[PDB]
Amino acid sequence: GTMTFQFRNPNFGGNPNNGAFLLNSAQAQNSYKDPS
Amino acid sequence: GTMTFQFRNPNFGGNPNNGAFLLNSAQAQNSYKDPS
Amino acid sequence: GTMTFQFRNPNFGGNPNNGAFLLNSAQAQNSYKDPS
Amino acid sequence: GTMTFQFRNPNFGGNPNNGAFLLNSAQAQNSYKDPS
Amino acid sequence: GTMTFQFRNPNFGGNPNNGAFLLNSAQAQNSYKDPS
Amino acid sequence: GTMTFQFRNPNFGGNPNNGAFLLNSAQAQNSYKDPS
Amino acid sequence: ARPTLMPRAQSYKDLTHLPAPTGKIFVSVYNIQDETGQFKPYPASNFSTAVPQSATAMLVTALKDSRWFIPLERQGLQNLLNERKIIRAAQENGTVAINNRIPLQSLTAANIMVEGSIIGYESNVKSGGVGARYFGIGADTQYQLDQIAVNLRVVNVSTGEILSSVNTSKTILSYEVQAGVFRFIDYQRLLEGEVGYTSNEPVMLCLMSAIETGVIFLINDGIDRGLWDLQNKAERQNDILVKYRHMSVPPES
Amino acid sequence: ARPTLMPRAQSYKDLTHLPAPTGKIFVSVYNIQDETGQFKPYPASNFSTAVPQSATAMLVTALKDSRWFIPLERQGLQNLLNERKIIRAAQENGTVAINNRIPLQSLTAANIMVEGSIIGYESNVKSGGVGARYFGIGADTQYQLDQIAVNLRVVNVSTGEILSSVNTSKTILSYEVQAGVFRFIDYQRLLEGEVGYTSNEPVMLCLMSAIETGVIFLINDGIDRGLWDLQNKAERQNDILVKYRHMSVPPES
Amino acid sequence: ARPTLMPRAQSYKDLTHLPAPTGKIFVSVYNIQDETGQFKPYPASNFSTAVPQSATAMLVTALKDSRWFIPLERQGLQNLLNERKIIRAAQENGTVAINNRIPLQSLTAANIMVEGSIIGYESNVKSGGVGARYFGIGADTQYQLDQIAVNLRVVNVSTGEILSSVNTSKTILSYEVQAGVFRFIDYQRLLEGEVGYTSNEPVMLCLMSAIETGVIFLINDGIDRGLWDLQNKAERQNDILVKYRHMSVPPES
Amino acid sequence: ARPTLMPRAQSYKDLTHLPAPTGKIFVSVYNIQDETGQFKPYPASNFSTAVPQSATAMLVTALKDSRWFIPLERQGLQNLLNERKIIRAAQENGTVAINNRIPLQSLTAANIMVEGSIIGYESNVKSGGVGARYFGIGADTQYQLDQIAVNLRVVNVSTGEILSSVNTSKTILSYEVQAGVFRFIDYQRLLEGEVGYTSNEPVMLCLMSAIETGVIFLINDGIDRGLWDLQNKAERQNDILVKYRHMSVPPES
Amino acid sequence: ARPTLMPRAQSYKDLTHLPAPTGKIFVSVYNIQDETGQFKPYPASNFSTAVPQSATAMLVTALKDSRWFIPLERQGLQNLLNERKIIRAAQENGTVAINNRIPLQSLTAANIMVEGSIIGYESNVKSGGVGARYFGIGADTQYQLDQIAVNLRVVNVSTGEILSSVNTSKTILSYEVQAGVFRFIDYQRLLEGEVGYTSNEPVMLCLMSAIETGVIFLINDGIDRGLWDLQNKAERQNDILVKYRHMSVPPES
Amino acid sequence: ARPTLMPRAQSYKDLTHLPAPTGKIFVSVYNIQDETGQFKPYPASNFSTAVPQSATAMLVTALKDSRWFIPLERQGLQNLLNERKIIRAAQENGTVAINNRIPLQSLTAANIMVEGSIIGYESNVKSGGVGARYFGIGADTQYQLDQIAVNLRVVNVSTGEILSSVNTSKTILSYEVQAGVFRFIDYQRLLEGEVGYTSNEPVMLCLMSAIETGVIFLINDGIDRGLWDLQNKAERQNDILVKYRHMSVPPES
Amino acid sequence: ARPTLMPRAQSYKDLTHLPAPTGKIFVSVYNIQDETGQFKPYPASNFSTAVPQSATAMLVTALKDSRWFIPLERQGLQNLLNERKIIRAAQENGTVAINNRIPLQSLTAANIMVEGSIIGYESNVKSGGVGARYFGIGADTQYQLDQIAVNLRVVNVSTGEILSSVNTSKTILSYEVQAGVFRFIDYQRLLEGEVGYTSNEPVMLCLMSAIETGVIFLINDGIDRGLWDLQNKAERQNDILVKYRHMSVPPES
Amino acid sequence: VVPQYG
């Protein structure tokens, strides 16, 4: 049919429901410890 | 089609669902400790 | 009827509701401990 | 009426709302302890 | 009017919203302790 | 107008949203301690 | 897949082997309306009818295979009269082609005309289902059955009386069988599977078999009331006829 | 992509190599209505029909490639009569152009006229699917099949009787194959992939192959009942004809 | 942007360089209806058709550029007859202006009239997509292809028979390419980016190229069956003609 | 704001400075229909068309400013004939006012009549967007482009043939630029800002510039095929004409 | 509030002080249709048009205040002819009242008739907004501007040609200013406030000022092309006329 | 509550005390259409108009109370002609009752006929609101104002010209005042209250006062242009007239 | 419950005891249209009107009980003329039954005819509510009032002028009273109760009382302007008349 | 055939 472009990120114009999945999948991936 | 401008922030006129993602992405980014 | 292809993942173009089930089913499956 | 086949699992093409019930009913059922 | 049969359980074909009430009402009812 | 009978309980055919209120109002009411 | 003939029920094999008459009866079928008034529910469109609007072309086929009737096309009568006007206006001039040089005869008209309707459609007459799950693994079934009813009546075209009228019914069965697995096999692994299958009887096909049944009730009743004769009185006791004569007492509820 | 001819099924290669008759039959196809009454469900529009409204122009093509019929345009008859009125009103005056100076002959009219309908459309007759997932990695399939049915009947234009009538069917198959990965590879990294593919058989194309099958059932039946002759009696045993003569017994359910 | 000519496919460059005939053929195109019956799904309006209603004005253009036909306007015939009535009523009086003092000749009328329809439109015949994400960074593609089909048939206006009829098809390709980044770069900072792009083939443009293909199938078939002659028999083996003569065998599925 | 003239594209400045003919051509424009069939999607109303229904009054303006044509009002012909009936019925009596005492001449009628349609409208042909955010601060862009196409053909009113026909296209560009800040500046304070801007090209204005382009393609083609003459043969090589003569080869895709 | 006159823009004060002609021109305005085709989006009703359907009664007012035209009512012509039939049927008898004893004269008919349409309406041509919040306290603005366009053309009723045609445009500005406070003042107290204000320009009022501009473009063009004369040649250089003569070059984009 | 007269604005008390003319003017009001095209938004029905369809019966009342006009019923003219046909057909026979024995006179017909429309309705021209809350206790206001506009023009029925035309406007004010308390008074007790009030001006009543204003602008303009005379020249300086003569300059924006 | 007479307001007890005239007035009531244009909002159906369509049969009842008028049925005039045609066609023959042997007299026709409309309906003119809750226990009220308005005008059937016209109004009051308890009585027990009550005034009943008020304003005005006489001049000072004569000054807002 | 005039 018709393909419309949409941002998958609620920071840009996007569906606000997958913001909670986006931040949880990034904080389950970071290995950076606190520099001290 | 037609591009309508909308604020992405529920502080202004915007979709109220991404407020919880907006504050969680900012509090996961601040490095400011308590001044004492 | 008509079969439309859709991604089952909200990282791609997909329904954002099953993101919370996708990350919970993966973190209940990983056996990788912290390397130290 | 008309019976349409649908997967009851959001891993496949299904309603994403019962993913949280599916994982909670399985983690309330497992008896497997950590091998060590 | 017309009575349609529907399963009240999201394990079968049913409304996925009452899965969380179904598991919470069963885990508030079990008396079985851990065998050891 | 027209009065239709509906069960107020999601155990029977009813709206699944008030299941969480039904169990919380019953567990805030029970006085039964553990027999030992 | 590849196309084939439309599949038939037991009624078409029952209708084809009817005993032979002395002669065939010319019959006109004008219109069989969808008098159910029922449309399809959600998630179908609001405009789609529950019963197909083609019950006229189903009866004319069923009368034709019966080896008792010679149907005459009256549904496309407005197109048939327009083709003969193209001939007849050219017949007066010398501008006829090599075909149609001979003068055409008039329209053959019938002695009877069977007409009728689809008298109501009722969805979800009975429903049910059995589901059961032990630890992680289980299965469930469902079923819904609908109901259709077709009226057919034979009109004498000379006087206008109604000679015989019958109502035949049919139950459209739909079911669904499903089984699923969601279980924790050995620590921090998740086995999971699901196998399902549904089946809807086509209401296009149950309407065809409800009309084919109603023709045998019309033909067998005519032998009883003396409307028309069989080719032999000894074949009154035909084993297809006595099947549809001991069904003339209706079921009770 | 680039355009090409409309793709054909096995029935068109089956229809083209029919044995030769002695002569062709003039035939008029006026209108084949969408008598299914079925519209498309959600998420399609409420107004879009499930079967295309172009079954008239599909039969006239299928009769033309059969090398048995010479169709005459009666669907655009109102436009064809308007073009001849522009000629004939100019023919009386001396204001004819260099073309059309010769007097036109009358309209060629037919000996038969085949008409019919699409007798019902049923969606989701059968459905199913098998899915299975081990730890992180799995796949699933689905299928849905719809059903269509087309009536065609040959009318003698002289008398008005119906010479032969057949019902052909076709199953529209739609399926979907998908596989996905969501797994934690080595600590705090997330590997993830998804590959899927669907396929819907076009109901525009299954309607064309259900009509092309129904013409061979009409042509082969005419050789049986003596409606028209082949060019040789020895080609009665043609291997295309005996394929569609041993299909004359319908399937059972 | 600035306007320009409508862009063309390979078929228009294929149609323009056809070999020359001996003379052109007058042709009337009355109406090409949208016989698909298909409307656009959600999120489009419920009333918007899937295929544009302008297939009549697309064929008349395609016949005109072919250097084989001289089309005559019959779509605006009701407006063309009204303009000539304004002349002819003034011609009887002496109140004619300086223009139109000379008596007008009658309407030029045609020897053939091509008509046809858009025989069905099917959306989402094939769909698919491949997505993959490693730690934070990944990409995905998708595609959907629709299908359109156009019937065209040439009618002899003298007799009324149909000389030739062809069905051409075209696949409307739509795809989408997207890539996104969501990753924690060095402690308590969040790098994030997203780049995407889609592309829909215009069904307005695929309908024009499916009609332009169908004219070359009509012209090349007329040279085969002797409907009309080329200017030279040596240009029977033209390299544009043999491209569309070895496509006359249809694809199989 | 205050009203002004309708803004024009480069095509109107291109159309106005066309070289002078020997004489002007009377032309009638009856109706240009919205043959796109496309309506606006959500969140607009279900009834609002995507293309405005005023393409008739846009061409008559574009023909008038071209200094080549004298258009005659045929869209309000039913109102123009009613005003002359009020004069002519009063002219027989002595009850004429001080105006209209002189007898009116008949309606001026044209030698050509250009007509056509809007051949399809396609939304979201191309779409895309680039977004990027570092810590708290970022920006994103988007764009969507639609497409419109207009047919125009010149009909000789004497015979009825179509002299020339062209198809012009135009791309309606819509974009959006946005930037936002959401960041924790020094402890327990929240700085936050957002600045955005969109822009939609008006399809009312792109339709006007697609028609103004199509008139120059009609006028320049008439000088090529000898339909009408310029005032000087030396101005065949005009720099506006050679711009629209080297665009006669269409773009490829 | 209390009612008053309809408020006017600068164009009505510009239109009223036009220089005097030698005589006024009788003019009929039959119908100005809403040829935009655009309806209002959500949350308005699906049936409400974006532009009001009263552009006919707006032009007749604007022509009347111009001190150049004497309009004649043709919109209520069917009611005006019915009132004169009540007089004229009573005039034959002696049953006339004390009024209307004198014989009425015929209808005054016009020399020109201006007609036209609203050529498209485009919503959200430009949009934007700036928002900013420090700790607890901030504000934001927005704006959206729509666009309207009106065609008007003057038709000579004697011949039928179109003397002059203009297109005027107008931008409908809508904005919104808001400010809000949500802050914790001294421990466990919550100060909170919000002040906002919006403003929509009425499209009823911008349509009236786009028509009033188009009349001055019609009147000033008639003095240029010699359609009608001013009362003095020295007032050709009027400061209202040279304002609308140096706007005759259109804006570019 | 108990019913009463319809409440009136200041304009009706302004209209009633107009100075006396020499004689009254017969006037016919046929139809005043709702030319706004605007319907009510959500949550009202999609079919309910924003302006009531009874502007015809509002003007005839307003002309009647003005002590200047004698209106004649032309809206129920089809019912009035049917009642006189019942009399007149009985008058020929001797079957008249005791009433209507005398012969009826013909219909009184008018010298002028005022007609017009409601020229557009615009909702939410201005909106705003101020809210503020300290600890637990606060309040807020809102307002929205709509706008309506009514055209009225007086037509001379003898010739057909339009003598005078005015546009009157009116702003429909709607507001809302609310205050609420939600506060913890002394430990583990919750005091809570809420008091609110809204008010919508009825658009039924603002339409009546916009028409009553437009009649005084019509009557006062007739004294200026000499259409009709007052009973005394000394009452030209009436204090009601000079109120509506110093409003003849329109407001600016 | 059991049925009874329709309940009446104070206006019907006010209307019944009017002083006696000298004679009654024949009156025809043809049609009173629902000129409000307002439909019911959500959750009612989109098609249900806000005001009932039976205002015609309400006035004829109200005129009948007034002891001043003798109404003649013109709403069922098409059925009344059909019954007399059945008599009159049988009267010519000798086939009359025992009833209707005598020749019928002609239709009684009226001297006046009152007609009018429902001039607008406005919902939610005023709204409000007061709620308050202390610890666990509280209550709240609400109210909404709508407004209706009815026009009635008396037409002289001889000439056609309008003798008198009045507008009556009525406010439809709807309210709601509710109280609820949700409180923890002694440890781990939950007392809870709720008692509520609403009341909507029927707009069917407020329309009847707004028409009954408008008849007394019509009757009392006729005694003032000398349209008809009372039976005694001493009963000019009747206490029902002076109640509706001191209401002739309208309320102000 | 169909006639060609050119």
Residue numbers in the entry:
A (entry chain P), B (entry chain Q), C (entry chain O), D (entry chain N), E (entry chain M), F (entry chain L): 1 to 36
G (entry chain E), H (entry chain F), I (entry chain G), J (entry chain H), K (entry chain I), L (entry chain A), ...: 10 to 262
N (entry chain X): 2 to 7
From the paper:
The curli biogenesis system in Enterobacteriaceae such as Salmonella species and Escherichia coli (E.coli), also known as the nucleation-precipitation or type VIII secretion system, is responsible for secreting curli subunits into the extracellular milieu to form cell associated nonbranching and highly aggregative amyloid fibrils. Lipoprotein CsgG forms a nonameric secretion channel in the outer membrane and transports CsgA and CsgB from periplasm into extracellular environment. Two soluble accessory factors, CsgE and CsgF, have been thought to bind to CsgG and play a crucial role in substrate (CsgA and CsgB) secretion and curli amyloid fiber formation. To address these questions, we determined the structures of complexes in curli biogenesis system by electron cryo-microscopy (cryoEM), including CsgF and CsgG (CsgFG) complexes both in the free for and bound to the N terminus (residues 1–22) of CsgA (CsgAN22).
To investigate how CsgAN22 binds to the CsgFG complex, we determined the cryoEM structure of the CsgFG-CsgAN22 complex with an imposed C9 symmetry at 3.34 Å resolution. The overall architecture of CsgFG-CsgAN22 complex was nearly identical to that of CsgFG complex. The differences of CsgFG-CsgAN22 complex from CsgFG complex include two additional densities on each CsgG subunit outside the CsgG periplasmic chamber. One being a part of CsgAN22 (residues 2–7, sequence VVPQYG) and the other being a CsgG loop (residues 104–110) missing in the CsgFG complex in the absence of CsgAN22. This loop was found to be flexible in CsgFG complex and stabilized after binding to CsgAN22. Six CsgAN22 residues (V2V3P4Q5Y6G7) were trapped in a crevice on CsgG surface mainly by hydrophobic interactions and hydrogen-bonds. Using multiple sequence alignment (MSA), we found that the Val3 residue of CsgA was conserved and interacted with a small hydrophobic pocket surrounded by residues I121, L172, L236, and W237 of CsgG. Gln5 residue is highly conserved as shown by MSA and forms hydrogen-bonds with the main-chain residues Asp238 and Gly32 residues and side chain of Thr31 of CsgG. Tyr6 interacts with the CsgG subunit to stabilize the adjacent CsgG loop region (residues 107–110). Altogether, we found that CsgG recognizes CsgA mainly by binding to the conserved residues Val3, Gln5, and Tyr6.
